[PDB]
Design a protein around this nucleic acid. Structure first.
Ligand SMILES: [Mg+2]
Ligand SMILES: [Mg+2]
Ligand SMILES: [Mg+2]
Ligand SMILES: [Mg+2]
Ligand SMILES: [Mg+2]
Ligand SMILES: [Mg+2]
Ligand SMILES: [Mg+2]
Ligand SMILES: [Mg+2]
Ligand SMILES: [Mg+2]
Ligand SMILES: [Mg+2]
Ligand SMILES: [Mg+2]
Ligand SMILES: [Mg+2]
Ligand SMILES: [Mg+2]
Ligand SMILES: [Mg+2]
Ligand SMILES: [Mg+2]
Ligand SMILES: [Mg+2]
Ligand SMILES: [Mg+2]
Ligand SMILES: [Mg+2]
Ligand SMILES: [Mg+2]
Ligand SMILES: [Mg+2]
Ligand SMILES: [Mg+2]
Ligand SMILES: [Mg+2]
Ligand SMILES: [Mg+2]
Ligand SMILES: [Mg+2]
Ligand SMILES: [Mg+2]
Ligand SMILES: [Mg+2]
Ligand SMILES: [Mg+2]
Ligand SMILES: [Mg+2]
Ligand SMILES: [Mg+2]
Ligand SMILES: [Mg+2]
Ligand SMILES: [Mg+2]
Ligand SMILES: [Mg+2]
Ligand SMILES: [Mg+2]
Ligand SMILES: [Mg+2]
Lengths: 123, 59, 72, 175
RNA sequence: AGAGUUAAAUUAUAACUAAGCUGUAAAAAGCCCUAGUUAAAAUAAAAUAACCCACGAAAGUGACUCUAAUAAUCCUGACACACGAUAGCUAGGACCCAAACUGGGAUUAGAUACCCCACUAUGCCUAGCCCUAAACCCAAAUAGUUACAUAACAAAACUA
């Protein structure tokens, strides 16, 4: 997977939820994006109250959209989630599973350093 | 090393061939939307000092 | 220590700045007078070139620009 | 300006078997459509290093390095067209260019014909580093402008003085 | 270098409550269109992580996300070429906070200061300059070696 879309959406009922989800996904496919999977993390009380579009929201729906999109495109996508009155906050992050795990080998111990101060017979 | 690279790229291309069937398309919109609405997946994860993982408790 | 060399400089610099304020406008007069010699000696350097190269007048299309007196 | 097409099927995926029977979704993902800019640079690199060169296999060749450098250079040229305030990159570019000119010098010393080919293909025109790097300033460039004027006036008036005598001695010799 | 984003704080400005609030060794001045609590954008600045030691040629760089991206099959090299912290200049914006300056209050033989109160250029953004620092790690660059060896101190001594 290439890009990840963290969506926090206004807390709602079922219909308008499916509405926001689909229309957003269609914006994505519209910029040329290709969607791998769609993930709902539940609806929770947010870590803090966020102020979006003349509204300070307490609760919210949590969503994850993983997709492939071209470099040029990404900026545009953000604009489209930006003016959207129902999005409590957009973010697009380089997808976590692209990043490599190069093995933590362990702790290679750092011994005490020597030959800093010169040998002097002082006092 | 030409062998090695040929193999790797073959593995990859066939993997994306596999996941090509799993994608969300103009059709899958109504289906997948209402499917994910149904099924919350938890990413929540914890750790213990031994290195053992303990995921969220079974419900 | 070495400060005592440096301290000298400090005083010797400070005492300069003071001077440059009091003597300031006097210094402007002398300076602009000095550009007024500059541009002129430039001129003679060129006139000497016509009058060595034999032409009485300056070559066609020569206004002989003022560089030293340039401002703005 | 050249154009490594949207459908060009990323360089590391180009030579693997059974690609062209595959569905449009995966050909859309492995297209230069979804790629970083580094991949499109790998492509421009491939193409330039085939068209200009002889032995595309040699990296160590002075010539192939000249090419790759020209690629990075061109990349930085667009990048410096977009960002006009970015000094870091401007330095990258301005140095890169002189490394290229250093090694072009190195080739004009060793292999002539190949060097002439590289000049003809990539668009690089090798010019001599001049004698005496100096700072041309107002006064000097001015004095030189005048001097050139005085010169082109003196030889002109000389031509008038010699043609008056050519016309007079000719008109006396004829009748 | 762009483009977007904001966590804690602060403040406009409202609503309750209190008459005091701010400030020092100690006091005055100052504000009471003040303070506390409850609400809240804009600008600015980026706790902790860091007991880390990465990146950049140096200056520098440690809030968040993405795009662009780190010269050289790699010795040295100018007065040439491109950079360069703070402060400063020019024009257009910004202004919560800080603050040269100036004005009050004290301190004092005096106080053009140290201490307090305001408040400005000025720090901030865009374009263009100016090209200076104890720009210092006061240790030139690139190969090397730990053999000879202690002026003194400090970052032990040397070849090419
Ligand atoms: Mg010692
Ligand atoms: Mg003196
Ligand atoms: Mg003089
Ligand atoms: Mg040479
Ligand atoms: Mg002649
Ligand atoms: Mg900017
Ligand atoms: Mg307040
Ligand atoms: Mg106190
Ligand atoms: Mg009072
Ligand atoms: Mg710290
Ligand atoms: Mg550090
Ligand atoms: Mg790149
Ligand atoms: Mg490098
Ligand atoms: Mg080097
Ligand atoms: Mg060098
Ligand atoms: Mg500067
Ligand atoms: Mg400034
Ligand atoms: Mg201004
Ligand atoms: Mg101000
Ligand atoms: Mg304001
Ligand atoms: Mg203030
Ligand atoms: Mg006073
Ligand atoms: Mg006294
Ligand atoms: Mg004292
Ligand atoms: Mg103020
Ligand atoms: Mg600044
Ligand atoms: Mg420094
Ligand atoms: Mg120092
Ligand atoms: Mg330093
Ligand atoms: Mg020095
Ligand atoms: Mg010295
Ligand atoms: Mg050097
Ligand atoms: Mg040795
Ligand atoms: Mg001794």
């Amino acid at each position: 997977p290439r890009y990840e879309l963290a969506l926090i959406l206004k807390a709602m009922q079922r219909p308008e939820t499916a509405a926001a989800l689909k229309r957003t996904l269609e914006a994505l496919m519209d910029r040329g994006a290709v969607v791998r999977n769609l993930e709902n993390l539940g609806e929770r009380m947010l870590p803090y109250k966020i102020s979006a579009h003349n509204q300070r929201h307490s609760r919210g729906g949590y969503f994850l959209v993983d997709f492939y999109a071209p470099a040029t495109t990404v900026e545009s996508m953000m604009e489209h989630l930006s003016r959207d009155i129902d999005v409590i906050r957009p973010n697009i992050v380089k997808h976590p599973l692209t990043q490599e795990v190069k093995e933590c080998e362990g702790i290679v111990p750092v011994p005490l350093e020597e030959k800093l101060y010169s040998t002097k017979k002082r006092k | 090393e030409a062998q090695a690279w040929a193999q790797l790229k073959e593995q990859e291309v066939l993997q994306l061939q596999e996941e090509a069937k799993t994608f969300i398309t103009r059709e899958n919109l109504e289906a997948r939307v209402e499917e994910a609405l149904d099924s919350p997946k938890s990413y929540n994860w914890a750790i213990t000092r031994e290195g053992l993982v303990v995921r969220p408790q079974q419900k | 220590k070495n400060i005592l060399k440096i301290r000298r400089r400090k005083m010797n610099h400070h005492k300069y700045r003071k001077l440059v304020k009091r003597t300031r406008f006097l210094r402007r007069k002398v300076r602009e007078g000095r550009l007024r010699q500059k541009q002129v000696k430039f001129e003679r350097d060129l006139k000497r070139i016509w009058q060595k190269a034999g032409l009485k007048e300056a070559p066609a299309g020569w206004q002989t620009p003022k560089i030293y007196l340039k401002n703005q | 300006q050249d154009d490594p097409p949207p459908s060009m099927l990323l360089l590391d995926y180009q030579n693997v078997p059974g690609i062209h029977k595959v569905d449009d979704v995966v050909k859309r993902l492995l297209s230069l459509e979804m790629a970083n800019q580094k991949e499109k640079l790998k492509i421009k690199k491939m193409q330039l290093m085939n068209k200009v060169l002889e032995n595309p296999e040699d990296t160590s060749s002075l010539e192939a390095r000249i090419v790759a450098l020209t690629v990075k250079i061109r990349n930085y040229e667009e990048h410096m067209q977009k960002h006009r305030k970015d000094k870091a990159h401007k330095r990258f570019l301005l140095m890169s260019i002189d490394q290229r000119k250093k090694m072009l010098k190195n080739l004009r010393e060793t292999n002539y014909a190949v060097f002439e080919k590289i000049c003809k293909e990539l668009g690089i025109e090798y010019t001599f580093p001049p004698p005496y790097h100096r700072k041309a300033h107002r006064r000097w460039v001015t004095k030189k402008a005048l001097c050139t004027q005085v010169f082109r006036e003196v030889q002109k008036l000389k031509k008038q003085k010699r043609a008056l005598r050519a016309a007079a001695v000719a008109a006396h010799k004829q009748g």
